[PDB]
Design a protein around this ligand. Sequence first.
Ligand SMILES: Nc1nc2c(ncn2[C@@H]2O[C@H](COP(=O)(O)OP(=O)(O)O)[C@@H](OP(=O)(O)OP(=O)(O)O)[C@H]2O)c(=O)[nH]1
Ligand SMILES: Nc1nc2c(ncn2[C@@H]2O[C@H](COP(=O)(O)OP(=O)(O)O)[C@@H](OP(=O)(O)OP(=O)(O)O)[C@H]2O)c(=O)[nH]1
Ligand SMILES: Nc1nc2c(ncn2[C@@H]2O[C@H](COP(=O)(O)OP(=O)(O)O)[C@@H](OP(=O)(O)OP(=O)(O)O)[C@H]2O)c(=O)[nH]1
Ligand SMILES: Nc1nc2c(ncn2[C@@H]2O[C@H](COP(=O)(O)OP(=O)(O)O)[C@@H](OP(=O)(O)OP(=O)(O)O)[C@H]2O)c(=O)[nH]1
Ligand SMILES: Nc1nc(O)c2[nH]cc([C@H]3O[C@H](COP(=O)(O)O)[C@@H](O)[C@H]3O)c2n1
Ligand SMILES: Nc1nc(O)c2[nH]cc([C@H]3O[C@H](COP(=O)(O)O)[C@@H](O)[C@H]3O)c2n1
Lengths: 441, 444, 439, 435
Amino acid sequence: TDPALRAITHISPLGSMDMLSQLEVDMLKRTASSDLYQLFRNCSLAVLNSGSLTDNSKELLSRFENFDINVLRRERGVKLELINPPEEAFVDGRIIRALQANLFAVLRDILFVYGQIHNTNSVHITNLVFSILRNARALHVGEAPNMVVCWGGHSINENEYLYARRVGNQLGLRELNICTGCGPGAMEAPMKGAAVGHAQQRYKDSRFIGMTEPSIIAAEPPNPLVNELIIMPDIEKRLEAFVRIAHGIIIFPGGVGTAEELLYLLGILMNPANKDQVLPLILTGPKESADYFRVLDEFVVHTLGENARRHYRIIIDDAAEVARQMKKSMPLVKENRRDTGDAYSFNWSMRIAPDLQMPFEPSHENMANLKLYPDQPVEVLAADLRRAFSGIVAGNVKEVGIRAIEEFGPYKINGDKEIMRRMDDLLQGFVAQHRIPCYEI
Amino acid sequence: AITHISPLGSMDMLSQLEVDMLKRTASSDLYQLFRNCSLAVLNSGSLTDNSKELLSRFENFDINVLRRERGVKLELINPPEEAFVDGRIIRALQANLFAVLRDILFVYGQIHNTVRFPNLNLDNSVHITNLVFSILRNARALHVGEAPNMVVCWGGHSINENEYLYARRVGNQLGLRELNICTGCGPGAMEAPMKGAAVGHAQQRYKDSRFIGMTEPSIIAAEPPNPLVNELIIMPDIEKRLEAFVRIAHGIIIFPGGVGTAEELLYLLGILMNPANKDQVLPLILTGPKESADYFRVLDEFVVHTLGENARRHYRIIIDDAAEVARQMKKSMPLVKENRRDTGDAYSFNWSMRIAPDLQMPFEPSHENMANLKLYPDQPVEVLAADLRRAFSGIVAGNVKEVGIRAIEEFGPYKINGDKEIMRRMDDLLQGFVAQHRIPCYEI
Amino acid sequence: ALRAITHISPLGSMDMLSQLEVDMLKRTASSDLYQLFRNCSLAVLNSGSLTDNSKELLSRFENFDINVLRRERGVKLELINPPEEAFVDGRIIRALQANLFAVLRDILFVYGQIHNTVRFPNLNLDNSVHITNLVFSILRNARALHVGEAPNMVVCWGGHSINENEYLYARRVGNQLGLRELNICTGCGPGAMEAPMKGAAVGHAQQRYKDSRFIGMTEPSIIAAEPPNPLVNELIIMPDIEKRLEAFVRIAHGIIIFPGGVGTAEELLYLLGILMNPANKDQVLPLILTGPKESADYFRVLDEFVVHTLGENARRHYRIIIDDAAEVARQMKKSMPLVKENRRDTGDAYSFNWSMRIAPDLQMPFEPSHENMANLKLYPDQPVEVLAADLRRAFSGIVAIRAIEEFGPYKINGDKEIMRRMDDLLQGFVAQHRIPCYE
Amino acid sequence: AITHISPLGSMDMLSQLEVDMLKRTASSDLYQLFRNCSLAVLNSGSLTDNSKELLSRFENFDINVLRRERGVKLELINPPEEAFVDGRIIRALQANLFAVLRDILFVYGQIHNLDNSVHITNLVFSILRNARALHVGEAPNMVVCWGGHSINENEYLYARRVGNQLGLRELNICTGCGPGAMEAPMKGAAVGHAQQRYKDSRFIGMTEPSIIAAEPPNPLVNELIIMPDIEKRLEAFVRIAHGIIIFPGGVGTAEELLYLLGILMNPANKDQVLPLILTGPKESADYFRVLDEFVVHTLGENARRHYRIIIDDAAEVARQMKKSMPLVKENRRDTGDAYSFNWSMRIAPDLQMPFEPSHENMANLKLYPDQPVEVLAADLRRAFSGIVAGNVKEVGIRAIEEFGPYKINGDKEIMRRMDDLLQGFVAQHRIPCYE
Ligand SMILES: Nc1nc2c(ncn2[C@@H]2O[C@H](COP(=O)(O)OP(=O)(O)O)[C@@H](OP(=O)(O)OP(=O)(O)O)[C@H]2O)c(=O)[nH]1
Ligand SMILES: Nc1nc2c(ncn2[C@@H]2O[C@H](COP(=O)(O)OP(=O)(O)O)[C@@H](OP(=O)(O)OP(=O)(O)O)[C@H]2O)c(=O)[nH]1
Ligand SMILES: Nc1nc2c(ncn2[C@@H]2O[C@H](COP(=O)(O)OP(=O)(O)O)[C@@H](OP(=O)(O)OP(=O)(O)O)[C@H]2O)c(=O)[nH]1
Ligand SMILES: Nc1nc2c(ncn2[C@@H]2O[C@H](COP(=O)(O)OP(=O)(O)O)[C@@H](OP(=O)(O)OP(=O)(O)O)[C@H]2O)c(=O)[nH]1
Ligand SMILES: Nc1nc(O)c2[nH]cc([C@H]3O[C@H](COP(=O)(O)O)[C@@H](O)[C@H]3O)c2n1
Ligand SMILES: Nc1nc(O)c2[nH]cc([C@H]3O[C@H](COP(=O)(O)O)[C@@H](O)[C@H]3O)c2n1
């Protein structure tokens, strides 16, 4: 169909999409013909660009502008044609199996999942999240709890990396499996250690999950350790499924996305209906992360109240203790699901409120109608804080309207201007570690 | 009195909104079916080989879909006590039960009533086949990369002592060569193979036997599955049952099943003698003990006179040579593997096989419909055999079923019209089958 | 598609062999041991025998001969005129392939080596520590003892020929036993040694147990005549009946004795003489005797004989169930966790009962010389352990001659009431069809 | 300060009379070997690379053999605390420890003919069989990876790069259990196995009682074998490998490449397939240059049918290695040889025998081109094992002052190449001790 020089390879499916119905295959193909192709292409490039020697992002992706991918139809199932893929993703002309699987992964979540809902109620949003993970063969039936979600920051310095490896090698010396946001630095070090420790302790089925969104994976290649890759429709459905599959959470330094994620966490942990649930939240870093955490906690205790630190707990420069506590909490998390009658792998009990599930358009009017009142209940005040925060993080990676920072005025944030005064040094502090301007009186 | 069972195999990871949907559907009129089938599942291997008498004893039995946050459970109010060893359900029985929950409630209920999958008109043949595939994929029944070894084994409900022995032997041979059996879940001809194949898999240290039994809600409800069946599948109607028999077999051995097997072959030949399927490899062997000779042959004549010597290519008869039937099968696998390899086709499912729409949809033997059934030699062989199958479906047991009798006492017998010699051959077959104990209800 | 010279590769036993050991196989194969290795190998290949014959079945293949090949990697086996039923489409049946290399394992590699070749010193073969440590290295080299194995092994004894009831019933015991995820070990033979495994199969099937272990133990003279039954997964051949019985005891976590005619009497008296010994008052080895309806009286006379000879203290080590298939499994399954605990507290292994003190008396083999028979001390002043040990050697010889015609009938210098119960049991067994041979 | 350990993998099912053998062997003079090797195994993974001083901290340590009816247990008096997690011994550390109980207490003590070349080879096999390292029915993927104890960072990176490429092709690594070049190949291999989903890595590390006494096994070694001497350690290196890859190990690579070319160039081994790739970074081009020159002159250019030199192409190093594997299988197939043990390879009994560098013997060593190539290299290795060892050991400093320097007989041109290679080896910083 094309006479040019176009290095091709035909890949068979590995670990997803393997048993496909015919009428599903058609659907896969008709979707790869829609406008969705760009995402499907750009994600598939980042998937084959994993663990690239050159530690770049935009420039790495621009080199392969000759790249393309096609969905090939066969009576049995389906195959992926790879025109001009990066050479590093192949050994002796065979695709590396990790990558293969993570490729067919992107077929699954971007063209099979993301297609059927986006190219076509908080109960629907959860059962749908469950369904995605079930289809991802990620909820293992009869699995004792060992999953420790690790949130963290895109860029991090050398000490912070070192310490997050140590937490990992510990987590792993205790036979605990890790999830992250499939990205780099903080989302990577914990697995990198947990492997070594998984090794030493002869653990034989290391789960290193990695949850992400269309807009993140299109630019950010999954770090190489990720052995299971899940892509969810939006951040909103990403954070929800983070929480539901976790048996522990360990926030790291990181800066902006972390802070935003913490508020998401807390406003589900402080809701009444969830005073019985057991999800250990240990924040941690290295010695030089002392002041950073400090001001974080100061911010929460001001906004949400001191009663908010019911739910968290800060260990500093004790890699071993963080893994020890996470290991001890695992029985309790089982039991706490035992007597609810709740799946060990999916926390159906945790009540996440529709405000936490509803997506925040980065529209200017959205922040201009935002509310920050101490009279608002702790839950509502925290959800609005998180939605403003996930909008700022989207203002550099989604680029849906980058010039709307001050297009007809600054984001009218009506309410206690002292909440913003606390974020003054907080936001500049993230800029300090390289992680009324935007608000309004 | 009341035991609560956990899932085993089927229904292990359920979404809440789904568990839920079971309990509603469990309350619908469908309930009696769900109960009947679950009582049958628990009465497998019953020391009493009684059909209706065995189930009528357990009238106090009843079953309840219980909801928990994790998943779903089953409440067993007065279960037959045999099915419990030291208080625990027999793991086999457990998994068969949760199979009835899968195909009876999550599968039958859902596609017939709630339009959750919209795009399913269930007349379009593409939709019927793809569905037959979704049913099977969900029963974890199709395996990816499973090199071909499934010998589907059609037979007869009641069979004499010799036929059993002979069919057990074929199974032993089949399983001495590491071939897995699939039957129609029942007793006799559908039990005897798996029963021997078991000793075969054993001697040959074959591990992970697959003894599939495929069935339909009316069959299972009256007839418990035989105790050997390892994977239970319940297809909505015979039509979907046969159609799935085809697609998942890599070989087919038709044992002697009385006048029933006659429409069986015809159905098989219908798809086989089709020009788009002149390339598909599907070993069709018939076989039987010494005495089954006469019975296979009188069949043979009829087929060749109605369809031709060309029909004799697709099948093969063998008699009292058990082993050779295992031998030809084990041989034909690699060719069947290949036949799929070049057509770019799944090993476990035969997508390419064109089963014809008139064979997918059901046929009702209305006295008007019967006589309009075109049966003459000009009409191509495909249509000839398929109408011959529908014509045999109605006239066979046209006197056993009291529906046929009452209707052939009102509107008269089946005055079918087509070609004189054909109704001669269609007769012959029945006069011989009657000679072998295997106005009339029919007319020219 | 097969010939009459076929070359079989190893399966499951003798897989990794050093060249110097490979040589040892061939030199022992050319020595006088050959007939044994020949007869046994024919036997193994004649399992699943469609024809229900014994000696007539094996005498038909006089052309069969087997030879030890040599390659650099290991050993292979040369089958010259094997029987055809043990091959399918020119492949050897994988069952028979193991059991063949099994016989190669124990008859030539073991029995050859330990008897004479001083390649292994420190083999007094009289010291009872040596016999026991030897029985271990056998079941070890036979990959028979599994590390970290929760106890599920139930040894079954019984009669090689049994009516159709005794078989049907022993089948049900198996079915139930199996349904509880228990593994059976018998003496490899027919009838009472087949039915437990035969049923045990179906229920292992119903309960999705995925590693049946139908062990069968035997000794060279028996297997030469009796082909193992088709169910046997592990074949193990022990040098003599004595070392076979010791290893029975060591591997069992339960012993059921079925209706084995007068053939079980020495069997029970063998168990008792280790169970009633002192240092074994803490050990946990359930001993049920069972049978179907008609076996009732057959145990009856039996139990009487033991009570009166050894005492009612022998009823401590056994129990008796009749026609309750289901129960004999239920109790057996129940006893497993206790058997784990008793080996646990004692610091002992689960697969091998080191701590049972088996009498050196019972380990050594018995000569029923008329002098030795008379000198056999059969008095109740002697302790119950030695009383049962001497009562067994008495029954093994008197029941199972040319010498009672040369010298005389077996005038045992025993206590008369012991001799009185002895003859009364023999007469009661004659009522059940199960000057005399004694005096 | 005491813990008790159960057996993991090694020594798990033992007969009672064997157990007794373990105890009395432990109480003898072999105790010190056991203890210092046991100590080193518990010291794997330590951040401190002061191999010796590390052991000097834990001089309180001691180790007792515990009897039980079931088997054996290991009492640990004052064990290093880092080798535990929440009181649980690290499983890796558990296993290698019992492997020292295996090869040092059980094996070494008991075996101490050993004079007949066939007896030595069958024993090396019985040692590898008891170590459960020979897998029956195993496609050949073992690449033995020789190298040097301390290498700079560019050889460490390069050796790692090799491994990753080896791994990425589903190939297992065998090394000398140490660090430096014996670690980076496995360390790489690790990352790669993962990427390709290779789920059964076999990072065999073989060694001798003297080596492991002071040196903790590097943390990647899955399976630890300890052979009695070096002579048997090498012979074993040879029979289990399917290829060999020689990293830049300084002058320590000289006798090695000779020993190997000895068995390769002997006649009866003209049909065996054992690839030999020598690789390294760019800094190693001169270093391999003089090595290859010295050989082409002494043994002939026929010797370069047996060794190939690749420099700075890690991919190809593996690519060829991975291509060789099917050929090494077939080569064992048609000979009727094991795929796990190269029984057919003829090792000459002199290469199996230890060489004592007595002034008399090294002078008696025949070193002239008149003798044949197989013998020449053998004597050349026995030459270098004393010559270069001269400038380091006292037998080549102290003995050459007492009875005079080493006046070797043979041919002058050979001795010229020898000295010329050495002068090379001094120039890359890797009458003297030799005349
Ligand atoms: N609550 C809960 N139960 C689960 C889960 N996964 C598996 N199970 C098992 O379901 C089985 C049914 O026992 P129930 O007592 O009725 O469970 P329930 O809490 O919902 O009532 C339990 O097995 P069991 O008989 O109790 O054995 P075991 O759990 O003690 O080992 C339990 O282990 C889960 O994610 N949540
Ligand atoms: N058509 C088809 N291919 C399948 C099936 N299952 C697995 N395969 C794999 O697909 C490979 C065929 O590659 P292609 O030759 O391109 O098939 P294609 O023309 O239809 O695209 C098979 O090669 P292979 O030679 O069969 O490898 P192997 O399975 O013997 O290892 C096998 O690895 C199936 O059910 N149908
Ligand atoms: N007696 C015996 N023990 C064995 C055997 N195999 C493994 N073990 C284990 O030994 C462990 C007990 O620790 P030890 O320190 O050795 O006991 P000991 O004092 O009697 O020597 C148990 O693990 P655990 O987890 O502590 O006990 P459990 O819960 O598994 O039963 C037990 O399972 C065996 O063949 N026999
Ligand atoms: N040389 C050698 N042979 C081994 C090894 N391991 C297993 N075998 C097998 O021994 C079996 C006997 O076949 P032969 O044809 O006699 O082998 P040979 O030439 O090497 O002597 C072969 O099985 P097969 O059924 O005949 O063929 P295959 O498909 O299993 O490979 C072969 O694979 C080994 O480490 N080395
Ligand atoms: N045993 C084992 N098992 C796995 O699954 C692994 N995945 C990645 C590694 C490597 O990660 C570390 C990288 O840290 P680095 O040395 O580059 O600074 C290496 O020390 C390696 O052990 C690894 N090791
Ligand atoms: N799961 C399992 N595993 C083995 O290893 C087996 N070996 C033999 C059998 C058979 O036992 C019965 C034979 O008795 P039959 O009724 O045929 O006379 C068959 O119905 C089979 O189940 C078997 N089953």
